[PDB]
Amino acid sequence: HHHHHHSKLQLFVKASEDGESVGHCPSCQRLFMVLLLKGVPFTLTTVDSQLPILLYDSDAKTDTLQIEDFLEETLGPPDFPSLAPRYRESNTAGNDVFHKFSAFIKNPVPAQDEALYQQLLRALARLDSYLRAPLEHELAGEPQLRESRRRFLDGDRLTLADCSLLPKLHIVDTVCAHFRQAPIPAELRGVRRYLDSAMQEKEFKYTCPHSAEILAAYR
């Protein structure tokens, strides 16, 4: 079904430095994921306003959030699965991780280093607590459940929320690990399980750019 192409729905995304494959771009990956999860035929095209961009008919859409809402609305039951999360909080948890990572990783002030890192950790901590908290349907079946059993944000299936966050969270882990020897702390069991579960899902695994690409983006 799905058609990738370098050198009808069509997604234009960034190519890698050498042009050989998919480039670093967490928004590009987000939409790549949405499209795969819809199970709709599509063409993805790498490129050497701003990407990602989507063509439907002759018509374009250039804004990540807009493209996403469109794909969620236009492609629905019974032809396509809806990917909206069920619970409000799936949409907000970890909403600040990426911003806090970016301020940490770009900081040139020695005396602010630990401080900004702590802010990063605290946000990762809150994401962790949500991932470990049993959701409604989990309790509906098991009334005394203490620790959530689920794989992802909203349950055991990838949703729009995961599509947005996983690409960002992958970068945080990749960059912090390699550059500052600061992998996601083992204490955050829910965050750790979440990244690992994601790597076992074809739609996340096969939309990841090579690690070298992410590393190069940060130098």
From Swiss-Prot:
Annotated Pfam families: CLIC-like_N, GST_C_2
Domain GST N-terminal, chain residue ranges per copy: 15-79
Tissue and organ expression note: Detected in placenta (at protein level). Widely expressed. High expression is found in placenta followed by lung and heart. Low expression in skeletal muscle, kidney and pancreas.
Enzyme class: oxidoreductase
GO terms under biological process: chloride transport; positive regulation of sprouting angiogenesis; signal transduction
Membrane topology: Single-pass membrane protein
Superkingdom classification of source: Eukaryota
Disulfide links within the chain: 25-28
CDD domains: GST_C_CLIC3, GST_N_CLIC
PANTHER family tied to this protein: CHLORIDE INTRACELLULAR CHANNEL 3, CHLORIDE INTRACELLULAR CHANNEL PROTEIN 6-RELATED
Oligomeric form and interacting partners: Associated with the C-terminal of MAPK15.
Domain notes: The active G-site contains a dithiol Cys-X-X-Cys motif which mediates glutathione-dependent redox catalysis. Members of this family may change from a globular, soluble state to a state where the N-terminal domain is inserted into the membrane and functions as a chloride channel. The redox status of the active cysteine in Cys-X-X-Cys motif likely determines the capacity to adopt a soluble or membrane-inserted state. A conformation change of the N-terminal domain is thought to expose hydrophobic surfaces that trigger membrane insertion.
Family according to the record: Belongs to the chloride channel CLIC family.
Protein name according to UniProt: Chloride intracellular channel protein 3
Organism: Homo sapiens (Human)
Gene it is expressed from: CLIC3
